[PDB]
Ligand binder design. Structure first.
Ligand SMILES: NC(=O)c1cnn(CCO)c1
Ligand SMILES: NC(=O)c1cnn(CCO)c1
Lengths: 264, 265
């Protein structure tokens, strides 16, 4: 892994592992999402972070994911080498954005793209806030100044408003709980686990006959280590689904999302 | 990754990832176990397998894990490079064995070792059997002929008989179920998931104050995709030892039994 020539983006190569692939011998969307997180972490490290800045540590502020959007054209096969390029951009005082481009290292063709929105939060009170002048200045020296979008298109899928699933759900997977492998180094549930939980309510027949093309996921509230989740799905249609993750007890919303699948 | 000079073992380097580490910023035992499986798979591929031999595919036979034993001296930190060497050995008609050695790539020191026992099974009937002469000869050209043991010692921990936990268990974690990420390419539960399930019944205070030094796990029966598991633990003991049992939540059918040894940080 290394920063590019201008120092405004970062690239890394990965060889797809045996336990990282599903039934079609290609990487799962969760493996892709893990690789995106890893290259994001390596980018932050290369430019002097830890993604907390000096002003963020002084004010006890952290970046939290608000939205993740992934589009895959070809999932890499077991043993294939995939190259991922990542970069960050400031979005005024709303927050920041991290984008990714996935390419087949042998053919050089784009096989996937992703975009994520991050918001500022006080790590103690858990209260969201706007980006201060001081943080925006310390982030700009590591970001491209002109816009650089993984999803440039006017009215693309990554910025669509997602509705709340109405009961009864067509499909469901209940009593989902995180185990220690689902936690990050700070004992918080890893963001990729929520993608897995959303996908658990998709029926196996759809998975066996379709490929996941697009996934958009909103993050509303974190699942704690001792929480239990219900995963709900309804067909809205290619096949499209509307998703909802909520706490099994009180029914508190933790995530909402949509998936688009293509027939194999 | 590459086979060594003599072609009787395989080495591969790994850089420890951000999502692969726990609270201490070092690789979890499950990350180590995944890396062991990956280097094992790369070894099998390099010597012409896919690890069914020609005679195994003809008779619908597969290798299945009977036991896994891991000892860690130092867990590699996030960003560290670890080198793993693996090799196989035939154990007569009982089955085969795969061994591993883990080293810090920078210091060259051994930071861990592992050994696993595999038995032959008919893929369809699920019936265990002995290794035939034709299968034994077919894989001896890929194995060292003289013994090469990751655990050589006279009465070492890797070959100890494990007893069955008696109810009531001191600790328990109930209703554990596999999700799609827990399955391998053939839709079977990955062997590393069982290690995670066993560890779920260890109290968080032990995890926060101790490091896992040794884990020995027996595999009796597989957990199916629609099965639910209960994880049970009882302390048996400076060091803390536990006895473990995984069983199906319904009928109480045994799937795994094991022991863990932990040292104070
Ligand atoms: N606490 C959370 O996990 C979280 C993630 N996004 N948000 C709201 C974004 O506007 C809250
Ligand atoms: N997963 C199984 O069916 C399995 C694993 N080990 N064994 C018995 C080995 O003596 C059976």
């Amino acid at each position: 892994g290394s920063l590019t020539e201008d120092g405004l983006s970062y690239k890394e190569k990965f060889v797809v592992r045996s336990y990282e692939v599903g039934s079609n011998k290609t990487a799962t969307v969760e493996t892709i999402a893990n690789l995106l997180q890893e290259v994001g972490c390596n980018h932050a490290q290369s430019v002097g972070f830890s993604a907390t800045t000096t002003t963020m540590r002084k004010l006890h502020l952290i970046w939290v994911t608000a939205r993740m959007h992934i589009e895959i054209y070809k999932y890499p096969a077991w043993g294939d080498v995939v190259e991922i390029e990542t970069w960050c951009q400031s979005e005024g005082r709303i927050g920041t954005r991290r984008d990714w481009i996935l390419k087949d290292s042998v053919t050089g063709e784009v096989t996937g793209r992703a975009t994520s929105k991050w918001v500022m939060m006080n790590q103690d009170t858990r209260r969201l806030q706007k980006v201060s002048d001081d943080v925006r200045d310390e982030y700009l020296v590591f970001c491209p100044q002109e816009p650089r979008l993984a999803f440039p298109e006017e009215n693309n899928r990554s910025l669509k408003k997602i509705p709340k699933l109405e009961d009864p759900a067509q499909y469901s997977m209940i009593g989902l709980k995180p185990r220690r492998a689902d936690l990050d180094m700070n004992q918080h549930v890893n963001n990729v686990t929520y993608i897995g939980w959303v996908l658990e309510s998709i029926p196996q027949e759809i998975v066996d006959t379709h490929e996941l093309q697009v996934i958009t996921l909103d993050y509303r509230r974190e699942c704690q280590q001792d929480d239990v989740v219900d995963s709900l799905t309804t067909t809205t249609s290619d096949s499209q689904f509307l998703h909802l993750l909520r706490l099994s007890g009180d029914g508190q919303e933790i995530n909402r999302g949509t998936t688009l699948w293509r027939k194999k």
